[PDB]
Amino acid sequence: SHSLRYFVTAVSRPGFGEPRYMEVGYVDNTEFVRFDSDAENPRYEPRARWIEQEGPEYWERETRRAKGNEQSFRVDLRTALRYYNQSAGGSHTLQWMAGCDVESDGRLLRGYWQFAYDGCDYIALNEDLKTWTAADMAAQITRRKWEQAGAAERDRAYLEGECVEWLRRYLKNGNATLLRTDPPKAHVTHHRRPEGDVTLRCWALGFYPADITLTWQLNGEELEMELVETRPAGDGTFQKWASVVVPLGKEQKYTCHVEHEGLPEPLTLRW
């Protein structure tokens, strides 16, 4: 399935002036657009070649929508201060995620529309796309206002309508980039320890997208393993490693296994 998601952050800046306001758009977990109120003449900007095919109308309407959202977020921040009885002199953050997960057949699998204040859940549109979960009393006040306004109906119309429609358009126009894959290049490194035994480290490098499985097996059973979180290389590709400690001279009984959507089949390697 595929997803289109927007991640928005506002951070208040006590003293005088506008909060920092940021939006980022993703198709299946990769960034394609961004807006940042700290840029000099802030516009929605492309973050990949494929979306640059959109004309000046797209860029202008998106820039305008972001600036409209900046104003709603400014009002939101001040309201949150009043609901929590907080002072004007602290920094506070409001985050929002919205978007759609869509199946092969074009069905909307799940729509999202949810907010966090100071890093905690605030209010979320439920799976039914008709009711709101409110985390606390502040968010219950918001919920009653949104129930009276008919917010969920309008939100659901975006998530079922434009969100699905634009995702299909983006996949049509940009599927060469959005659906691209770079399989892992794997190798094993060998590190003698002071203790007289060996660390074998299985590296997966240069892969895209991020999801991967790395395992070690001994006599073809799984097992003892240290495993770093998947991390960016800085050039658009990802890295991971997994390691085990084995006897010197018995390295050959251990195999490293790599599964990734870019491979024609699972990779099996040894020292």
Binding site: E62, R65, N69, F73, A98, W146, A151, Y158, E162
Partner: peptide, 9 residues
Amino acid sequence: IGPRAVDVL
């Protein structure tokens, strides 16, 4: 294209 958060807290 992205959403509009027109309903305020």
